[PDB]
Amino acid sequence: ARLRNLTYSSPVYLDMEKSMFTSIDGNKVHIGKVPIMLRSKFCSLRTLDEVDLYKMKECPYDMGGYFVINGSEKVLIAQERSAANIVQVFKKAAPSPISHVAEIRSALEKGSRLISTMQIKLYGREDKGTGRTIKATLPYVKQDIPIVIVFRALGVVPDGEILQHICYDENDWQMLEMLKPCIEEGFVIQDKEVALDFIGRRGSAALGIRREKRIQYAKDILQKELLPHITQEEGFETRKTFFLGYMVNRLLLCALERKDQDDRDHFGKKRLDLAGPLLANLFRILFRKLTREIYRYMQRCIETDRDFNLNLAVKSTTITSGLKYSLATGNWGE
Amino acid sequence: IKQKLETQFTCLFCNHDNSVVCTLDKKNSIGLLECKKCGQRFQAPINSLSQPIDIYSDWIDACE
Amino acid sequence: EITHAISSAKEQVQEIIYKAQHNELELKPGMTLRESFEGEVSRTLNDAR
Amino acid sequence: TPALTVYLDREIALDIEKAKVIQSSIEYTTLKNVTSATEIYYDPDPTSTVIEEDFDTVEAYFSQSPWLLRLELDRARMLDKQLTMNQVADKISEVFSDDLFVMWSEDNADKLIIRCRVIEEDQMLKRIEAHMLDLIALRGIPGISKVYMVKHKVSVPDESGEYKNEELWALETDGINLAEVMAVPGVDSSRTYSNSFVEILSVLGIEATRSSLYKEILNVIAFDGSYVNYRHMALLVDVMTSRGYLMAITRHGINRADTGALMRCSF
Amino acid sequence: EDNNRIISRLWRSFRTVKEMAADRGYFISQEEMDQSLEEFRSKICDSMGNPQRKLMSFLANPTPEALEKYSDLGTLWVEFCDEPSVGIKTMRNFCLRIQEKNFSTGIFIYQNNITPSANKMIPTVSPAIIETFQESDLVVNITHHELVPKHIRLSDGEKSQLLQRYKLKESQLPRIQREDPVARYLGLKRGQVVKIIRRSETSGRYASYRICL
Amino acid sequence: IAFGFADRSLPHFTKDDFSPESKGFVENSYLRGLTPQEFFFHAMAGREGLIDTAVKTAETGYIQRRLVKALEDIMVHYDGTTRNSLGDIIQFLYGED
Amino acid sequence: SFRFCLECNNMLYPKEDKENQRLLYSCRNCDYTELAEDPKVYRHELITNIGETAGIVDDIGQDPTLPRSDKECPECHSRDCVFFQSQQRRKDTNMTLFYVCLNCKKTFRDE
Amino acid sequence: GLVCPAETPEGQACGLVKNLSLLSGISIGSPSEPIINFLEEWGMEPLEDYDPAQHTKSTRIFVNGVWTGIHRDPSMLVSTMRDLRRSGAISPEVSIIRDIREREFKIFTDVGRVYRPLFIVEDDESKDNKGELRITKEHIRKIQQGYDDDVYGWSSLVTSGVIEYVDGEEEETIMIAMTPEDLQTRSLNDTAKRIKPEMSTSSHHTFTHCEIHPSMILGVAASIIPFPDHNQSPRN
RNA sequence: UAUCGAGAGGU
DNA sequence: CACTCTACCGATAAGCAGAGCTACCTCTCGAT
DNA sequence: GCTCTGCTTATCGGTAGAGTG
Numbered sequence A: 001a002r003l004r005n006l007t008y009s010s011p012v013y014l015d016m017e018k019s020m021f022t023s024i025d026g027n028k029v030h031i032g033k034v035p036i037m038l039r040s041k042f043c044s045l046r047t048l049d050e051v052d053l054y055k056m057k058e059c060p061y062d063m064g065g066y067f068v069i070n071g072s073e074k075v076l077i078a079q080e081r082s083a084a085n086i087v088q089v090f091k092k093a094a095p096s097p098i099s100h101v102a103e104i105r106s107a108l109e110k111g112s113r114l115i116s117t118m119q120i121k122l123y124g125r126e127d128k129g130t131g132r133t134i135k136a137t138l139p140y141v142k143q144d145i146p147i148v149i150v151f152r153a154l155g156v157v158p159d160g161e162i163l164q165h166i167c168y169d170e171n172d173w174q175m176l177e178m179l180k181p182c183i184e185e186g187f188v189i190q191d192k193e194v195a196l197d198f199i200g201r202r203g204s205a206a207l208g209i210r211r212e213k214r215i216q217y218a219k220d221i222l223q224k225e226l227l228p229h230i231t232q233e234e235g236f237e238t239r240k241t242f243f244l245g246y247m248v249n250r251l252l253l254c255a256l257e258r259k260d261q262d263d264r265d266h267f268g269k270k271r272l273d274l275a276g277p278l279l280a281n282l283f284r285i286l287f288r289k290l291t292r293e294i295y296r297y298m299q300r301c302i303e304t305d306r307d308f309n310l311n312l313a314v315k316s317t318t319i320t321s322g323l324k325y326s327l328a329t330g331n332w333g334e
Numbered sequence B: 001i002k003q004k005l006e007t008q009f010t011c012l013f014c015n016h017d018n019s020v021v022c023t024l025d026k027k028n029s030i031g032l033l034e035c036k037k038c039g040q041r042f043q044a045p046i047n048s049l050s051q052p053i054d055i056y057s058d059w060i061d062a063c064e
Numbered sequence C: 001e002i003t004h005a006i007s008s009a010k011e012q013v014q015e016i017i018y019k020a021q022h023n024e025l026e027l028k029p030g031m032t033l034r035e036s037f038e039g040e041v042s043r044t045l046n047d048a049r
Numbered sequence D: 001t002p003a004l005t006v007y008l009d010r011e012i013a014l015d016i017e018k019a020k021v022i023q024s025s026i027e028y029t030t031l032k033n034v035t036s037a038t039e040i041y042y043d044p045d046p047t048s049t050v051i052e053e054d055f056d057t058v059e060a061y062f063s064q065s066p067w068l069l070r071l072e073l074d075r076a077r078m079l080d081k082q083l084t085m086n087q088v089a090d091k092i093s094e095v096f097s098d099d100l101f102v103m104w105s106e107d108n109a110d111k112l113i114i115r116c117r118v119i120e121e122d123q124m125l126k127r128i129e130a131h132m133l134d135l136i137a138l139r140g141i142p143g144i145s146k147v148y149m150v151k152h153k154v155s156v157p158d159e160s161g162e163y164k165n166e167e168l169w170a171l172e173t174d175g176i177n178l179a180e181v182m183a184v185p186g187v188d189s190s191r192t193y194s195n196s197f198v199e200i201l202s203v204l205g206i207e208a209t210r211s212s213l214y215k216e217i218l219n220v221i222a223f224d225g226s227y228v229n230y231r232h233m234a235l236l237v238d239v240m241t242s243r244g245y246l247m248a249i250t251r252h253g254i255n256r257a258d259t260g261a262l263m264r265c266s267f
Numbered sequence E: 001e002d003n004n005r006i007i008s009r010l011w012r013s014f015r016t017v018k019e020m021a022a023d024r025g026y027f028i029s030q031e032e033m034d035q036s037l038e039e040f041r042s043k044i045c046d047s048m049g050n051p052q053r054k055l056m057s058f059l060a061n062p063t064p065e066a067l068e069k070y071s072d073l074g075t076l077w078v079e080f081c082d083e084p085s086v087g088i089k090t091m092r093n094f095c096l097r098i099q100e101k102n103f104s105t106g107i108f109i110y111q112n113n114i115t116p117s118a119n120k121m122i123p124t125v126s127p128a129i130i131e132t133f134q135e136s137d138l139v140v141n142i143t144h145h146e147l148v149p150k151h152i153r154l155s156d157g158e159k160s161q162l163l164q165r166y167k168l169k170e171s172q173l174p175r176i177q178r179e180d181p182v183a184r185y186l187g188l189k190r191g192q193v194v195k196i197i198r199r200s201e202t203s204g205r206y207a208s209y210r211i212c213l
Numbered sequence F: 001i002a003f004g005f006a007d008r009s010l011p012h013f014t015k016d017d018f019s020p021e022s023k024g025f026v027e028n029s030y031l032r033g034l035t036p037q038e039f040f041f042h043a044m045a046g047r048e049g050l051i052d053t054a055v056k057t058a059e060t061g062y063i064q065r066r067l068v069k070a071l072e073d074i075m076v077h078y079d080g081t082t083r084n085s086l087g088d089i090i091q092f093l094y095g096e097d
Numbered sequence G: 001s002f003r004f005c006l007e008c009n010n011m012l013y014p015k016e017d018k019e020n021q022r023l024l025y026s027c028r029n030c031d032y033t034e035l036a037e038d039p040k041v042y043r044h045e046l047i048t049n050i051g052e053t054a055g056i057v058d059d060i061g062q063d064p065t066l067p068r069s070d071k072e073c074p075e076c077h078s079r080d081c082v083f084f085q086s087q088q089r090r091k092d093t094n095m096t097l098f099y100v101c102l103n104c105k106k107t108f109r110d111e
Numbered sequence H: 001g002l003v004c005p006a007e008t009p010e011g012q013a014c015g016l017v018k019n020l021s022l023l024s025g026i027s028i029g030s031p032s033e034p035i036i037n038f039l040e041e042w043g044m045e046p047l048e049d050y051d052p053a054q055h056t057k058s059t060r061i062f063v064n065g066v067w068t069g070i071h072r073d074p075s076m077l078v079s080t081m082r083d084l085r086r087s088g089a090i091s092p093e094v095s096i097i098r099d100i101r102e103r104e105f106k107i108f109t110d111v112g113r114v115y116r117p118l119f120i121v122e123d124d125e126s127k128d129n130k131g132e133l134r135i136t137k138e139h140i141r142k143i144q145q146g147y148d149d150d151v152y153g154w155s156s157l158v159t160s161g162v163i164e165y166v167d168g169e170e171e172e173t174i175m176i177a178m179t180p181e182d183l184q185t186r187s188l189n190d191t192a193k194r195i196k197p198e199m200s201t202s203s204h205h206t207f208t209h210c211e212i213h214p215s216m217i218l219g220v221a222a223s224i225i226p227f228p229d230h231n232q233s234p235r236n
Numbered sequence I: 001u002a003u004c005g006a007g008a009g010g011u
Numbered sequence J: 001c002a003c004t005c006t007a008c009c010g011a012t013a014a015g016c017a018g019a020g021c022t023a024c025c026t027c028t029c030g031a032t
Numbered sequence K: 001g002c003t004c005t006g007c008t009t010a011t012c013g014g015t016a017g018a019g020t021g
């Protein structure tokens, strides 16, 4: 591969099965080649042993960890990012009506992939900002929604239950005094249904969906998309409501100068993406592209009403060229 | 002070788009939708948090 | 001599820690207690070197 | 780091006690600076009090609204700023005249307390409390957050004519208010200086700005022991002041000139 | 007590206006210039101690020397207004007084502000000139500062002599803004030049010229 | 050296330790050699110097360019004046001497 | 200290009974009202000390990162405790130490 | 101990490009389901069963950033969880973090956590072992043999409770001795050798771990420098 | 004897 | 002759977008 | 990705004057 400027890569085959529901009222298909990291478990060099390493012109001091793409040895650089699924509280600059913000990036456990990001902002500066209330940010909603409103839209409506999820100390009068503006700014929303509708009326979607579904659209933005690392099945809003209160609690501990703001550079709050996660994020993008090419091919080849041979609807160049391109140029994407 | 706002909503009757005007009187908690074309009017209660999309939503449910 | 003089400078820093922790430390104008503490500790350690 | 250099009249500059008097009069002190805590009680009888601490105070004093505003002053900060309970209550009176009944305890009391009442009113007292801490100025020049007492060694000729040193007291501030501090009796109004040459330009004019600009640049260069010949810095400060206003060494200054377009577009 | 600082500051603003007038070339008697604070209080305050601004107004004429040098120097009217906020009503009576008595320049000291509407009555009164000062801004005479060297207005003849010596157009001299504190103190008008003699650490003395915008 | 861990500079110290050794005093000389704590603390100060050199070089380089463009056309003329390309007088005599 | 309505669980707001001249805590979503035990309605602390000691838990002696001292406990007179400066994260916070005896778990000072 | 303090490029990338220290590792990722099962088996109560009035002293428990339960005796819970990891019952790369002050117990099976190994010091005051290294010349003997007395290498030490991995978050809660000699107090005055810190702020130290060797804070490149402890740090 | 980029480096 | 009731220009911020970010030098590598 | 300044939009009064009782 080095000598002849070839790519050292393994063919990947995937079983595919067709089915045709009809109501009057395949096998080992090749999807692309994946470049193999030398001396890994999937490299033809992992066995052999010094005798045959020398016969393969391989140096026993070469420990691998790199790929061969068009003859060139490419190494992946560990990519540093912030940890997912952790709450961090930061302070905001002076010329802003917001003074403290809590943030969390939600990411699933399987695959490990980002999903969405959410914020809870405390408005009102120091003796500036009038009403000092607290609004949240929801995925796919155009405007910040006061905290009390989203608590009610989740099934906890009386003031006393909402505050029992946030403040865990009936004696803490400083924190309770700081929650005052949030209650009064969410006074007119006195039940779950008008809460869910208050949300749905800003979350993009279509114009003119009546209360009967624009609620049911907001019920989706809460079940999925909102803190999806907690759960995405229905009827588990008890886990999400308690977490929302935890965030607000953490937000206020810092605003009361009882706790320092989080240190974005603390290495324990950081993660390094190596070959696996880096390849997986790219393979996900490219396999969806292959997926869309399969769907687009059925709509032309099925208008003929001819049994499609599948292997004629999978161009393995989509995955093979995508992976080759990113490893060859260093541009990690399409 | 009253708020006179133009919107990009479609009138439910005459179907002219970008011709619904919303007048929100918060001092008396009374919101008013008006059509700049066919001239109809719809009234509904508003709170302090409401916006032209809140009463236009109430107008869709008042018809159906 | 060098090792002795550094040892005595470390002791002065102990005294300064004691005063600041027993509310017996002079506050310099325009400075919080902790700023004044760090300033006194810094002058002591730089003079030791 | 905004800062004023406040030279004092000679009689004050050689008497540390008189210089301290100028110091305490210049430093800005708000009501928020001396207040430790504020409270709002429901004390319905104006001539008595549910507060056991202020019992003997109001009973003897008497020999309006039921809501009480009770604020406590911190003894340490009241001592540092050199403020008496009387004058703190006086300043409150002046801004609230007859719309507020003010009652203050003596400086000998265990807690320093000021009681206030208006002459639905639960919220009106919170609005008043916010306005008081945020606007009431007890003394000093606004913008002067701290005043330091600095000793100057100034070389002045003898009676024999020989130059000898002479120690004189002056003041230096955090924050600036050159115009107001110049007017303060005691301050040598012919020498007061500010390290904001923008402020010098508004108070003293362009030729004074020229000198102040040079002084501030020289201070930067000379600090690490360096030395640049006068004519180079003089040339730069004349360029920055030739238009009659301060031309910044940025495109917003430089390219506001009537110079050719080819020259200006090459920057 | 606190009433004494009001009288003192007003007396200091008053001394500055006289100083300003003297430097601009007008004649002020050496008895009114040296007027103590006590004499000021006796003449200006009521029995209750409150001062009457309308009693502070005065008129002055150029000295013979100043009139020989500057032939554009007329009669000057200085008036302190008893009304803190000077509105369109107050300014009109002042502009009428200036034209009727045909003063060349009138200096109007206000207390708190001048409304922008009344401020437009200022350029409608030519060839007479109205200048405004906030009474605060005059408590200290800024030209007495170490950093402000002596500015001296050039005569029309002296200016021409300067331009020819350097073969200069007017736009090639260094400038001083009309609103410059020292330009306002001298009442500089567009086109007039000040000469400024200045300490120099390389030559001892250096003459700087600026022309008024 | 700041408490980059919770109330301490390194996991080798107890919390709330303000002693010389806890916050970066290097007692040893280069002859004797630095301890592991001193080594790291010295490398923290040293990194800051490499960062400063890499950063502030562009800060002052832009400053010098703006200074040059502000002043590039200013010349001493045969009448002794210092002028720009418009013939405006910047100084009536260079350096006042 | 503000309380909650016994029938609606929403928070009670202070309201005067003008005729009897007494402080009540009334609800705002229903007709419930109750008598106030405390005349104080509002407090604002500028110079605060809340959160000074903060997390003193039964297992604070198990945190091996805390320094240990010999100071004699006022309660049980044990010669073994852990200490820490104020947990208030303000810039003007004092540096005076809080000690926690590992025996009786009392929080004392060196005053 | 996680990235090299010396090896970083000069110039624009300075401090942004880093290099793994010699003993660093990166977490591969581990399933959380076995962690949940152990927590519920040893006393964790669900969040639907939870009231702050009833749980005014209990510890909140997080697993990969989701609040999953509360436990009333956290001191026993963490010791149990830690001992499962020190034997291999839990994957050694899992993070076990007790924040005692904040009453929080956090567990991470996340991929991408940077960790390093340390010697375990016996911390239980119920045995003469306490205060000393758990590792003995017997472990060192079996390491040199390659086999146990009924392969024995690095991971054998990790699953026999004498060495464990800690990441940056768990490192926040431990007390590390710099060398084995620092585990015990001493009686020097040799003017040639270097001065060791006094450590006189705490009367008695309770070490939980000990560094294997402090030179392992360096990466590949800086490990080539002879006597880097005698150089001005930029030269390294 | 190409062009557009990227990356790693030198003082 | 005492009142409001609205058409003015101040003086506000006020929000915003973009403009700019040391000098010179080496080499390899991929895409068009 | 971060600092600055200038330029283009809302808010603020502020009067300043006819309509008024």
Ligand SMILES: Nc1ncnc2c1ncn2[C@@H]1O[C@H](COP(=O)(O)CP(=O)(O)OP(=O)(O)O)[C@@H](O)[C@H]1O
Pocket (backbone or CB within 6 Å): F057, I011, J022, J023
């Ligand atoms: N990134 C950069 N940008 C601009 N100029 C640079 C530069 N890096 C180096 N230089 C030039 O090279 C000089 C650096 O010289 P070096 O050899 O790097 C250090 P020194 O200060 O001369 O010696 P030392 O090694 O004894 O400390 C700078 O002063 C400058 O002249």
Ligand SMILES: [Zn+2]
Pocket (backbone or CB within 6 Å): B011, B012, B013, B014, B015, B035, B036, B037, B038, B039, B040
């Ligand atoms: Zn219509």
Ligand SMILES: [Zn+2]
Pocket (backbone or CB within 6 Å): G005, G006, G007, G008, G009, G010, G027, G028, G029, G030, G031, G032
């Ligand atoms: Zn109720």
Ligand SMILES: [Zn+2]
Pocket (backbone or CB within 6 Å): G073, G074, G075, G076, G077, G078, G101, G102, G103, G104, G105, G106
């Ligand atoms: Zn005890």
